[PDB]
Amino acid sequence: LVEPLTPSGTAPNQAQLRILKETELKRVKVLGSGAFGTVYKGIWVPEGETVKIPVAIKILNANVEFMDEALIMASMDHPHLVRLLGVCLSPTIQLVTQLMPHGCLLEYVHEHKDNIGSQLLLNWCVQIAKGMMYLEERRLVHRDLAARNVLVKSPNHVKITDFGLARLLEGDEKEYNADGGKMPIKWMALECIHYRKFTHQSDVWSYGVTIWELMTFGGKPYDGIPTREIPDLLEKGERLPQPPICTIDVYMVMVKCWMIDADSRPKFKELAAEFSRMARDPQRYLVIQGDD
Numbered sequence: 482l483v484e485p486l487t488p489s490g491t492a493p494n495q496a497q498l499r500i501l502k503e504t505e506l507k508r509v510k511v512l513g514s515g516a517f518g519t520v521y522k523g524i525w526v527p528e529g530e531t532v533k534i535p536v537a538i539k540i541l542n543a544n545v546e547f548m549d550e551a552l553i554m555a556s557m558d559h560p561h562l563v564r565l566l567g568v569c570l571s572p573t574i575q576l577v578t579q580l581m582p583h584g585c586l587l588e589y590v591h592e593h594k595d596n597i598g599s600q601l602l603l604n605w606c607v608q609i610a611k612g613m614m615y616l617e618e619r620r621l622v623h624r625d626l627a628a629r630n631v632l633v634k635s636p637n638h639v640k641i642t643d644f645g646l647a648r649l650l651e652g653d654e655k656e657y658n659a660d661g662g663k664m665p666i667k668w669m670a671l672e673c674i675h676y677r678k679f680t681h682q683s684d685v686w687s688y689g690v691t692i693w694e695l696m697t698f699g700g701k702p703y704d705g706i707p708t709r710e711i712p713d714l715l716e717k718g719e720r721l722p723q724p725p726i727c728t729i730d731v732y733m734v735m736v737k738c739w740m741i742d743a744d745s746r747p748k749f750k751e752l753a754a755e756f757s758r759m760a761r762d763p764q765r766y767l768v769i770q771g772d773d
């Protein structure tokens with residue numbers, strides 16, 4: 482027979498995913514490595530073409546779920562989220578994305594500390610929130626939002642990366658086993674420490690921690706405090722301190738991201754809009770000396 486027609490006005494997903502030959506890629510050096518896998522700086526020469534496209538290649542240490550997640554990653558079309566360019570299937574599956582020349586935001590803030598102003602910092606808060614807004618719109622939880630997973634295309638333009646990988650490697654099992662989670666506890670929403678209760682509102686918590694990293698120019702959350710003690714401290718009401726440059730206006734935005742009640746936290750829509758209006762008058766909201 483012929484299948485009963487039932488249209489839904491959802492637009493076709495015409496995203497392209499390129500399956501790349503092993504030999505189209507060369508690795509220059511290592512950029513980073515961790516629970517997620519190793520990220521290499523590299524060169525992609527497409528099949529038949531000449532141009533040597535600067536790329537990052539990620540190798541991970543089920544494949545139906547991977548090819549499903551790869552579809553999501555390639556479908557992302559937003560200025561402040563990365564897009565997967567290609568997948569290489571051999572010898573093991575490699576992820577290929579455009580290299581960001583100014584690197585990771587966490588490294589960028591610490592290195593350019595003495596020359597980052599209030600306008601720049603407040604604009605990054607908007608761009609991050611916007612990209613997350615776009616993820617949420619698609620019902621996609623990042624699970625591992627952190628300054629370390631925000632890359633700098635140019636000083637005035639950041640992109641979020643590494644969305645999807647956490648769920649792909651961990652799964653959705655409510656109970657943690659003895660191995661625990663792969664994401665760092667100190668960026669994690671309280672409810673996700675105890676069980677896997679990952680939602681857009683848990684990402685919001687992580688957003689709060691991410692923007693604190695920026696306002697402290699690469700500060701380390703709960704610095705020195707061992708990760709075993711965190712779940713107890715958070716439940717006793719402990720939160721990150723007010724960064725020196727932060728007005729109470731900015732700090733309260735942060736604090737609201739760390740409410741016990743996940744529903745009480747700001748939505749990404751509210752976060753982008755508030756930092757937007759702050760970015761219209763950035764010296765009323767962040768107090769950095771020399772920032773005239």
Ligand SMILES: CCc1cc2ncnc(Nc3ccc(OCc4cccc(F)c4)c(Cl)c3)c2s1
Binds near residue numbers: 513564646
């Ligand atoms: C610190 C200096 C850096 C510059 C830079 N430029 C581009 N990509 C980088 N890292 C990177 C992170 C994740 C990667 O694959 C995972 C992934 C997740 C979601 C969408 C993607 F396109 C991909 C991939 Cl393939 C790469 C990095 S890291």
